[PDB]
C-alpha cells in the first residue's frame, strides 16, 4: 500500500549516529585518561600496511583510491535521486534496487573507515575529522533503515561533504602535481561541497518543519530549489521569490550568511583567475614554401619594433615578401598588439625564450633566412647588455650554426669575444654592428668633412620623397634625404674593354650615382653601389643595354708613449702652436663607463694621409678617465692630453679652440642617470660654452659636433631654430648641419644589412679607414695595434680614396661656381681629375636673396643634373692617394 507514514521516528537514526560518535569520543578519552593515570612490532606492521593501502603506493592502493572517488560520486547521485521522495517512507529492501546499491556503497565506506582508523596516527583527532564525522552520520542510518524497512531522508546531505577529499585523492594518484592545479581543485571542491551541503540542510529543514510547531511549517521545496536559493543567497542578490520560512531554516540562513558570503566572494574571483591562466602567444610558426622568413629577438619593445617594421617593410625596396617572426619572453601590451594587428599578414609574435631550444624549434630557425638580435642601447650597464646578447647569439649558434646573424654590440671588445664563437662564419654570411665603433667612425668622418656623418646616416634610413610648398632649407634637404644606398649587378654593355673608363661620365645616361671586391671611386661580375632614390629605377643598369706604418700599411703607427710624456698644462698648451687640429672634450668620472676612443683616432690616420697632413688630436678632460683608456691610447702618434674640464673657459683657451678644425663633445657618465631630463646636461653646457666664447669673433661659428644620448635634447643645441618635440631627429636643424649625432639613427643598419650584406663592410671601408680580414685577426689575437718595417707591397696598399672637402671660391672649378648645372660640375670633376662628389654642403640662408651673418650649412645628397649652384658652397669628394 501507500501512505505508509503516520508517526515519526527520526530519533532512531539520529540517536544511532549520535551514540556512535559520542561513544567513540568517550572511549578514546577514557583510554587517554587511563594512560595518564596508569619481532619488530605487529601493530606497527599492520599500521604500515593500512597506511600504504590508504595512499596510492601499491596497485591495490590505487584501486581502492579510485573506488573511493567513484563511490563517493555514486553516493552523492543516490542522495540526489532520493531527494525527490518524501521525507519519511516505507520501502522493501529485497524488492528495491536503490537500497541495495546504497547498502553496498556504505559497506565499502565502512571498510574504508576501518582502514583509515587503523592507519591513523592520533585516534582522538582522527575521530573529529570531517570525513569521520560524515561517516558516523551516513552509514549507521542506512543500516537502521535496512533493519526497519523504513527510509528517512535525514542527514544524507552530508554525503556531499565526502566531495572535499578529492584533492588528496588526486595528489595520492600523482595526477595533481603543480600548485595552480592543486589550488584550483581545492577551491572548487570546497565551494561545491559547501554549496550542496547547505542546500541539503535547508531542504531537510524546510521540508520537515521545526518540531516545536508540531511540524506544521512544511514548505515543500525541491532540492533544486534549495540549491538555487543558496546560490541566490550567498551571491548577495536575494531575489526573495524563494526563501526559508521555518525558524530553524531562518536560523541556518542567519548563521550561514556570515561564513558563506565571504567564501563566495573569496573563492569565485580566485577560481576565475586560476582558470584564466593561459598562454595567449603559444604555438609554432608554419614555414610556407617559396617565402623566406626571418626571426627577430632580443630587445623587443613598441618603439624598437615600430622603427624596425617601418624601415624593413618600406615601399621603396623591391617587391619581396620576407615574413618577420618576433620571439620575446614578455607578452606584448595593448599598443604592441595593435601594432602587430596593423601588420597582420606580414609579421607574427611567439612568446618564448631564445635560450630554450624548444622555442628556437618553435619559430623554425632551422629554415629561417636570418636571425636579428636587437640590443638595448639605453641601458644602465653596457656590459650586462652585451653579455645577454652574446648569450642569445651563442644559444642560436648552439641550436643552429648554419644560420646567419645580424646583431648589435654596444662595445668593441665584446665584438672580439663574438669572433671567438666557433661558428662565426662571416664568409657565407654574418654581421655584427658595433654602435660605438660606427658612431665614432661617423664622428671622425665628419671631423674630416663636416656634415658627412649626417648624409652617411641618412643614406641608410629609408625615406620616401616629400615636398613642401614654401621655399626653405628643409625643401632642398628633403630632396637629398630621399636617396638611399642600393646594390645592383652591372650590365653586359659595361663588361667590355674596361670597367673604370666606362664607369665614369655615364651617370647622365643611367640618371644614378655609382660609388669582385669592395670598390670606391674605381679609377686607374661586380656589384655597383648606387645612390638611387628608389629600387624601381635602380633596375636601369643591367636591364638597359643601349716602423712608420702598421703591419699592413693601412694606418700609421709610432713608438709607445708614457702618459706623463703627453700630459700637458694650460701654459704649455697655449705655448704650443695648434691650428686646424681636432679637440675632443671628454666627460667622465671615477666610476663612469668606458667609451673607447681608439675607433675615433684610427679613422683619422689612414695611409692616404701624410705625416705632415696628419691632424693633431688633443683630448681635454679628466686625467683619470684618460688614464683608464690609456692602455690602448699609448701606441699612438701626435696626440695630446689636457687635464681639467671642458666647462672651464681657460682650459679651452689654452688648446686653441677658436682655430681647431673640429671640437667633439663626448660623455661617458650618460649611462648612470636614467632621468630623461638630466641627460646630456654637461654636454649641452659645454656646447653652449663653446658657442658663447669670444676670440681677439664669437665662437658660435666654430665647427663643433655633440653626441647626444637623448634625441629630445636636440632642441637645446641651437637657438635660432624652431623646436618641436613632434619632428624627428633627421629633420632637426643641428642634425642636418652635422653638429649633432645619436645612435638612434644607426638602428636602420640592420634593415639595410640584411637586405644586402656588402653595405656593412662598405661602411667599414668608407668610415674607420679600413678593416681587412688580417687586421681583424690581429686585433682578435693581440688586441693591440703593432707595426713593422715597410715593404713594397705594404706601401702599394695605399691606392685608396678618402673623403675630402673642397671649397668653391678659388680654383679651376670657379667657372662652375654659379654655372647652374651641378651635373656639369661633377661630370667635369670626373673627366678632368677622376673625382666623384656625393653632393653639396650648402649655407642655410643661401637660398634667400637677402644676405645674413649665418654660418650653419646643411647637406644635399645627389642633387639633380639641373641643379643651380651658389659660389659659397662646399663639395664632398673622394680624393686619391699620391
Amino acid at each position: 500500500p501507500c501512505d505508509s507514514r503516520g508517526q515519526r521516528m527520526w530519533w532512531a537514526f539520529l540517536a544511532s549516529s549520535m551514540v556512535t560518535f559520542f561513544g567513540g569520543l568517550f572511549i578514546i578519552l577514557l583510554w587517554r585518561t587511563l594512560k595518564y593515570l596508569w619481532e619488530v612490532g605487529w601493530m606497527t606492521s599492520v599500521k604500515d600496511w593500512a597506511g600504504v593501502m590508504i595512499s596510492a603506493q601499491t596497485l591495490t592502493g590505487r584501486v581502492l583510491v579510485v573506488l573511493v572517488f567513484a563511490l563517493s560520486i555514486g553516493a552523492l547521485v543516490i542522495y540526489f535521486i532520493d531527494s525527490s521522495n518524501p521525507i519519511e517512507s516505507c520501502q522493501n529492501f529485497y524488492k528495491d534496487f536503490t537500497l541495495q546499491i546504497d547498502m553496498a556503497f556504505n559497506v565499502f565506506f565502512l571498510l574504508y573507515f576501518g582502514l583509515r582508523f587503523i592507519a591513523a596516527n592520533d585516534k582522538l583527532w582522527f575521530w573529529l575529522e570531517v570525513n569521520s564525522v560524515v561517516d558516523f552520520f551516513t552509514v549507521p542510518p542506512v543500516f537502521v533503515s535496512v533493519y526497519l524497512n523504513r527510509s528517512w531522508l535525514g542527514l544524507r546531505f552530508l554525503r556531499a561533504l565526502r566531495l572535499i577529499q578529492f584533492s588528496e585523492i588526486l595528489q595520492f594518484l600523482n595526477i595533481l602535481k603543480t600548485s595552480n592545479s592543486i589550488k584550483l581543485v581545492n577551491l572548487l571542491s570546497i565551494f561545491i561541497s559547501t554549496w550542496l551541503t547547505a542546500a541539503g540542510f535547508i531542504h531537510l529543514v524546510e521540508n520537515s518543519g521545526d518540531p516545536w510547531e508540531n511540524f506544521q511549517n512544511n514548505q515543500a521545496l525541491t532540492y533544486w530549489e534549495c540549491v538555487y536559493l543558496l546560490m541566490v543567497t550567498m551571491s548577495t542578490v536575494g531575489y526573495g521569490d524563494v526563501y526559508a520560512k521555518t525558524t530553524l531554516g531562518r536560523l541556518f540562513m542567519v548563521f550561514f550568511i556570515l561564513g558563506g558570503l565571504a567564501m563566495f566572494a573569496s573563492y569565485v574571483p580566485e577560481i576565475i583567475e586560476l582558470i584564466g591562466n593561459r598562454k595567449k602567444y603559444g604555438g609554432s610558426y608554419s614555414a610556407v614554401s617559396g617565402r623566406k622568413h626571418i626571426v627577430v629577438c632580443g630587445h623587443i619593445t613598441l618603439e624598437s619594433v615600430s622603427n624596425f617594421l617601418k624601415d624593413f617593410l618600406h615601399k621603396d625596396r623591391d617587391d619581396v615578401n620576407v615574413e618577420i617572426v618576433f620571439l620575446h619572453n614578455i607578452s606584448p601590451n595593448l599598443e604592441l598588439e595593435a601594432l602587430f594587428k596593423r601588420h597582420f599578414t606580414q609579421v607574427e609574435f611567439y612568446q618564448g625564450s631564445v635560450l630554450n631550444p624548444h622555442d628556437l624549434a618553435r619559430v623554425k630557425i632551422e629554415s629561417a633566412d636570418a636571425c636579428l638580435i636587437l640590443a638595448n642601447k639605453y641601458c644602465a650597464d653596457p656590459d650586462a647588455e652585451d653579455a645577454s646578447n652574446i648569450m642569445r647569439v651563442i644559444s642560436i649558434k648552439n641550436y643552429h650554426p648554419k644560420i646567419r646573424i645580424i646583431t648589435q654590440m654596444l662595445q668593441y671588445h665584446n665584438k672580439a669575444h663574438l669572433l671567438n664563437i666557433p661558428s662565426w662564419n662571416w664568409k657565407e654570411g654574418d654581421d655584427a654592428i658595433c654602435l660605438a665603433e660606427l658612431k665614432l667612425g661617423f664622428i671622425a668622418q665628419s671631423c674630416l668633412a663636416q656634415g658627412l656623418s649626417t648624409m652617411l646616416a641618412n643614406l641608410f634610413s629609408m625615406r620616401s620623397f616629400i615636398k613642401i610648398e614654401e621655399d626653405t632649407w628643409q625643401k632642398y634637404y628633403l630632396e637629398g634625404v630621399s636617396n638611399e644606398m642600393y646594390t645592383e649587378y652591372l650590365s653586359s654593355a659595361f663588361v667590355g674593354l674596361s670597367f673604370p673608363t666606362v664607369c665614369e661620365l655615364c651617370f647622365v645616361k643611367l640618371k644614378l650615382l655609382m660609388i669582385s671586391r669592395i670598390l670606391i671611386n674605381p679609377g686607374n661580375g661586380t656589384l655597383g653601389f648606387f645612390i638611387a632614390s628608389d629600387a624601381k629605377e635602380v633596375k636601369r643598369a643591367f636591364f638597359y643595354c643601349k716602423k712608420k706604418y702598421d703591419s699592413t700599411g693601412m694606418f700609421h703607427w709610432c713608438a709607445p708613449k708614457e702618459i706623463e710624456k703627453v700630459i700637458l698644462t694650460r701654459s704649455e698648451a697655449a705655448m704650443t702652436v695648434l691650428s686646424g687640429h681636432v679637440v675632443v672634450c671628454i666627460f667622465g668620472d671615477v666610476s663612469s663607463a668606458l667609451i673607447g676612443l681608439r675607433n675615433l683616432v684610427m679613422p683619422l690616420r689612414a695611409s692616404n694621409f701624410h705625416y705632415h697632413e696628419l691632424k693633431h688630436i688633443v683630448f681635454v678632460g679628466s686625467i683619470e678617465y684618460l688614464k683608464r683608456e690609456w692602455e690602448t691610447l699609448h701606441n699612438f702618434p701626435k696626440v695630446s692630453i689636457l687635464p681639467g674640464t671642458p666647462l672651464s673657459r681657460a682650459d679651452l683657451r689654452a688648446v686653441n679652440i677658436n682655430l681647431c678644425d673640429m671640437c667633439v663633445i663626448l660623455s661617458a657618465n650618460q649611462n648612470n642617470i636614467d632621468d630623461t631630463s638630466l641627460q646630456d646636461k654637461e654636454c649641452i653646457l659645454a656646447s653652449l660654452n663653446i658657442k658663447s666664447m669670444q676670440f681677439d669673433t664669437t665662437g658660435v661659428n666654430i665647427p663643433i659636433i655633440t653626441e647626444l644620448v637623448n634625441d629630445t635634447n636636440v632642441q637645446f643645441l641651437d637657438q635660432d631654430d624652431d623646436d618641436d618635440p613632434d619632428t624627428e631627429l633627421y629633420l632637426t636643424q643641428p642634425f642636418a648641419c652635422g653638429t649633432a649625432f645619436a645612435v638612434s639613427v644607426l638602428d636602420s643598419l640592420m634593415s639595410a644589412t640584411y637586405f644586402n650584406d656588402n653595405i656593412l663592410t662598405l661602411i667599414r671601408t668608407l668610415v674607420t679607414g679600413g678593416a681587412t680580414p688580417e687586421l681583424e685577426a690581429l686585433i682578435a689575437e693581440e688586441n693591440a695595434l703593432r707595426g713593422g718595417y715597410s715593404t713594397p707591397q705594404t706601401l702599394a696598399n695605399r691606392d685608396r680614396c678618402r673623403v675630402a672637402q673642397l671649397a668653391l671660391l678659388d680654383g679651376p672649378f670657379a667657372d662652375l661656381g654659379d654655372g647652374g648645372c651641378y651635373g656639369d660640375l661633377f661630370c667635369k670633376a670626373l673627366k678632368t681629375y677622376n673625382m666623384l662628389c656625393f653632393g653639396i654642403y650648402r649655407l642655410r640662408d643661401a637660398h634667400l636673396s637677402t644676405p645674413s651673418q649665418c654660418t650653419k650649412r646643411y647637406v644635399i645628397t645627389n642633387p639633380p643634373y639641373e641643379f643651380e649652384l651658389v659660389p659659397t658652397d662646399l663639395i664632398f669628394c673622394l680624393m686619391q692617394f699620391d
Binding site: G6, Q7, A12, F113, G114, I118
Partner: protein, 262 residues
Amino acid sequence: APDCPEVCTCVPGGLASCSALSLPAVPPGLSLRLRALLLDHNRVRALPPGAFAGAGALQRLDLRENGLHSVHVRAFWGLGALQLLDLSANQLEALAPGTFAPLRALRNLSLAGNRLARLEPAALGALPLLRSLSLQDNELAALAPGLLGRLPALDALHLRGNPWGCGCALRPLCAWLRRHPLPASEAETVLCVWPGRLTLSPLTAFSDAAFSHCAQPLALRDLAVVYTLGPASFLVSLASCLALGSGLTACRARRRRLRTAA
C-alpha cells in the same frame, strides 16, 4: 408569554421553533423555560460568543441549513444541559479548539454537509456522554489518531462521501469499524477515495495484515537494537580490517623470511 421570542412559535413544554423566518442572527431574549429550539433555514452566518445565553436548560439545538461558516469558541458557554446539536448542511471549514468542551450532555453532534477539511483531537474535546456522530458529506481526508480516544461511548458513526485516503493515518479509524460493524447498506457506501491500488475498497475490508508495513509502536527490543546497531557495526568492521591486515602481514612475512635465499 415572556419566555417565547416575539417572532418565533412556542408550544407548552419548552418547545420553540424559529425556522423559515429569515433570521439574520440568534433571536434575543432566550429563556430558561425553553427545552428545544429550532433555528434551521435561516441566515445566521456569524454566531456571536454567548449567543445562546439565558437558555441554560435547553436540551436540543438545531442549526441545519443556516449558512454557518464560523463558530466562536465560547458561543455555547453555559449550555451544559444541551444534548442534541444539528450543525449540518453548513459551510464550517474549521472548528476552534474548546468550542464543544462545556457540552457534557451532548449525545448527537451533526456535522454533515460541511466543508470541514480536518477535524482535530482538540476540536471535539471531552465528550464522554456522546453516543453517536455523523460526519458524512465532509472533506475529512483523514482522522487524526486519538480523536476517537476520548469518545468511550461512541457506537454509531457515518463516514460516507468523504475523501478517505486509505493509508496508515486512518489505522485508528478502521480499528473502530472492526469492533463496531457498520451495517451492510451503509458499509457498501464507505469507500477509499485516493486513486491508487485501493479504490472501490470498503474500509471494513482492510485487515491488519494489509497494513503490517504501517509504523508499529515503539517496542523494547528494537529500541535497543537501533542504539546498538551503529557502534556494533563499526566495531565489527574495524576488527575485520584489523584481522585481514594482520593475516596478510603474517603471510607475507612468512613468505619473505622463509624464502629470502630462494
